[PDB]
Amino acid sequence: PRISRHRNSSKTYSTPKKPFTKPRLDAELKLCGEYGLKCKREIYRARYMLAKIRRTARNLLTLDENDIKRRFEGAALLRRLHMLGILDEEKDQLDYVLGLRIEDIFKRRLQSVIVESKLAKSVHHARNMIKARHISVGGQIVNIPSYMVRISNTSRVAIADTSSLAPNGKPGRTKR
């Protein structure tokens, strides 16, 4: 039955309902500079992930506590959000998801951690350094900019041996 064709596809990029609205438009460029996003499709990709994380909580809030569908899902909601760190582990609240920040998903993005930890010190520098394979999570080198790391293992972010950390001996064109 064409077995290798069987698969699934996703729509992280969801465009908004009215495009040319000045406030939404201005914020886009403002956010684009803040976290150093190369494409504008990603901010909407973030909006889709944010909404799913917002609805689960609204439906969960309307359920009474300790209702099994509520209790298991609530602990689940907290577990994933606490791993992300956008929800402070201390908050520990199913209702605490509401009032969520898009900036916090952006903060979770590993590209952001590199700027904050002064590993590259700039978002523009951060993307370029990751492009040149210069930041490794737990040593697993990633060249895709949005590695997105859980906060539980944020302390394990590391630099790369090729030309940033303790040079392996490969300085780009300078080597030759």
Partner 1 sequence: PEITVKVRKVLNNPLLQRQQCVVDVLHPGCTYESKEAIKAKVAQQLKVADQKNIVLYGFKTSFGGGHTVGFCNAYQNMDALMKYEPGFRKIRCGLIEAPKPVSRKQLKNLKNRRLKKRGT
Partner 2 sequence: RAHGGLTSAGKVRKCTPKKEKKEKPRPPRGRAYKRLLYNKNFVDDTLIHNGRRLGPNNLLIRQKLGF
Partner RNA sequence: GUCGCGGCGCGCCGAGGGCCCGACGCCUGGCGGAGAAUCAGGGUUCGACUCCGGAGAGCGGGCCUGCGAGACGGCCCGCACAUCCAAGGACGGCAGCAGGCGCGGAACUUGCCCAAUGCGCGGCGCGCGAGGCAGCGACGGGGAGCGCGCGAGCGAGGCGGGCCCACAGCCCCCGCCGCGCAGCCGAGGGCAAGGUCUGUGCCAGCAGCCGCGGUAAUUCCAGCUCGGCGAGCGUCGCGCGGCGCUGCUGCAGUUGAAACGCCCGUAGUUGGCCCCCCGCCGCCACGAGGAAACGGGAGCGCUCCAGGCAGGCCCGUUGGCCC
27 touches, from RNA, partner 2, partner 1, none (C-beta below 5 to 8 Å by class): none
CB of 164 to RNA, least distance (A): 6
Part in contact with partner 2 (CB under 8 A); list of ranges 34-42, 65-73, 87-95, 149-157: 34-42
Size of the site for RNA (CB under 7 A): 70
* Token code pair at residue 145: 């900019």
CB of 81 to partner 1, least distance (A): 29
Breaks, C-N > 2.5 A, in the chain lie after none
153 belongs to the binding site for RNA (CB under 7 A): yes
Q: Which residues on neighbouring strands pair with residue 141, listed in sequence order? A: 136
Judged by CB, which is closer to partner 1: 80, or 170? 170
Binding mask 115-154 for partner 1 (x = CB under 8 A): ---------------------x--xxx-------------
Q: How far apart are CA 51 and CA 1, in angstroms?
A: 36
Residue 62 vs residues 59, 91, 94, 160: alpha-carbon distances, Å: 5, 19, 11, 47
Q: Which of 56, 113, 114, 159 binds RNA (CB under 7 A)?
A: 56
CB of 102 to partner 2, least distance (A): 17
175 belongs to the binding site for partner 1 (CB under 8 A): no
121 belongs to the binding site for partner 2 (CB under 8 A): no
**Contact call for residues 166 and 153 (beta carbons, < 8 A):** no
Task: Write out the residues near RNA by the rule CB under 7 A.
Answer: 1-4, 6-13, 18-22, 25, 28-29, 38-42, 44-45, 52, 56, 72-73, 76, 79-80, 121-122, 124-125, 127-134, 137, 140-150, 153, 162-164, 167, 170-176
